[PDB]
CSV table of N, CA and C in Angstrom, one decimal:
chain,number,residue,atom,x,y,z
A,12,UNK,N,0.3,1.5,-5.3
A,12,UNK,CA,-0.2,2.9,-4.7
A,12,UNK,C,0.3,4.2,-5.6
A,13,UNK,N,0.6,5.2,-4.9
A,13,UNK,CA,0.9,6.3,-5.4
A,13,UNK,C,2.2,6.3,-5.4
A,14,UNK,N,3.1,5.3,-5.1
A,14,UNK,CA,4.8,5.0,-5.3
A,14,UNK,C,4.5,4.8,-6.7
A,15,UNK,N,3.9,3.7,-7.0
A,15,UNK,CA,3.9,2.9,-8.5
A,15,UNK,C,3.5,4.0,-9.6
A,16,UNK,N,2.4,5.0,-9.0
A,16,UNK,CA,1.9,5.7,-9.6
A,16,UNK,C,2.6,6.7,-10.2
A,17,UNK,N,3.8,7.2,-9.6
A,17,UNK,CA,4.9,8.1,-9.6
A,17,UNK,C,5.4,8.0,-10.8
A,18,UNK,N,5.6,6.4,-11.6
A,18,UNK,CA,6.6,6.0,-12.7
A,18,UNK,C,6.0,6.7,-13.3
A,19,UNK,N,4.3,6.5,-13.3
A,19,UNK,CA,3.6,6.6,-14.7
A,19,UNK,C,3.6,8.4,-15.0
A,20,UNK,N,3.8,9.2,-13.9
A,20,UNK,CA,4.0,10.4,-13.9
A,20,UNK,C,5.2,11.2,-15.0
A,21,UNK,N,6.8,10.4,-14.5
A,21,UNK,CA,7.6,10.6,-15.6
A,21,UNK,C,7.4,10.4,-17.0
A,22,UNK,N,7.0,9.1,-17.1
A,22,UNK,CA,6.2,8.6,-18.6
A,22,UNK,C,5.1,9.9,-19.1
A,23,UNK,N,4.2,10.6,-18.3
A,23,UNK,CA,3.5,11.4,-18.6
A,23,UNK,C,4.0,12.8,-18.7
A,24,UNK,N,4.9,13.1,-18.0
A,24,UNK,CA,5.3,14.4,-18.3
A,24,UNK,C,6.5,14.5,-19.3
A,25,UNK,N,7.0,13.4,-19.6
A,25,UNK,CA,8.5,13.3,-20.2
A,25,UNK,C,7.3,13.3,-21.8
A,26,UNK,N,6.3,12.1,-21.6
A,26,UNK,CA,5.7,11.9,-23.3
A,26,UNK,C,5.2,13.2,-23.2
A,27,UNK,N,4.8,13.9,-22.7
A,27,UNK,CA,4.1,15.1,-23.2
A,27,UNK,C,4.8,16.0,-23.9
A,28,UNK,N,6.4,15.9,-23.6
A,28,UNK,CA,7.2,16.7,-24.9
A,28,UNK,C,6.7,16.4,-26.0
A,29,UNK,N,6.6,15.1,-26.4
A,29,UNK,CA,6.2,14.7,-27.5
A,29,UNK,C,5.2,15.1,-28.1
A,30,UNK,N,4.0,15.1,-27.5
A,30,UNK,CA,2.5,15.4,-27.7
A,30,UNK,C,3.0,16.8,-28.4
A,31,UNK,N,3.7,18.1,-27.4
A,31,UNK,CA,4.1,19.4,-27.8
A,31,UNK,C,4.4,19.4,-29.4
A,32,UNK,N,5.3,18.1,-29.6
A,32,UNK,CA,5.9,18.6,-31.2
A,32,UNK,C,4.6,18.4,-32.3
A,33,UNK,N,3.5,17.2,-31.8
A,33,UNK,CA,2.5,17.3,-32.4
A,33,UNK,C,1.6,18.2,-32.9
A,34,UNK,N,1.4,19.0,-31.8
A,34,UNK,CA,0.3,20.5,-32.2
A,34,UNK,C,1.2,21.4,-32.9
A,35,UNK,N,2.9,21.2,-32.7
A,35,UNK,CA,3.6,22.3,-33.6
A,35,UNK,C,3.4,21.7,-35.1
A,36,UNK,N,4.0,20.3,-35.2
A,36,UNK,CA,4.0,20.0,-36.4
A,36,UNK,C,3.8,18.4,-36.5
């Protein structure tokens, strides 16, 4: 449920950092 999905959040928010670098270079 929401509990499990919460795990994907850390991956999304954290994974977002990587995407930020892509937009830069």
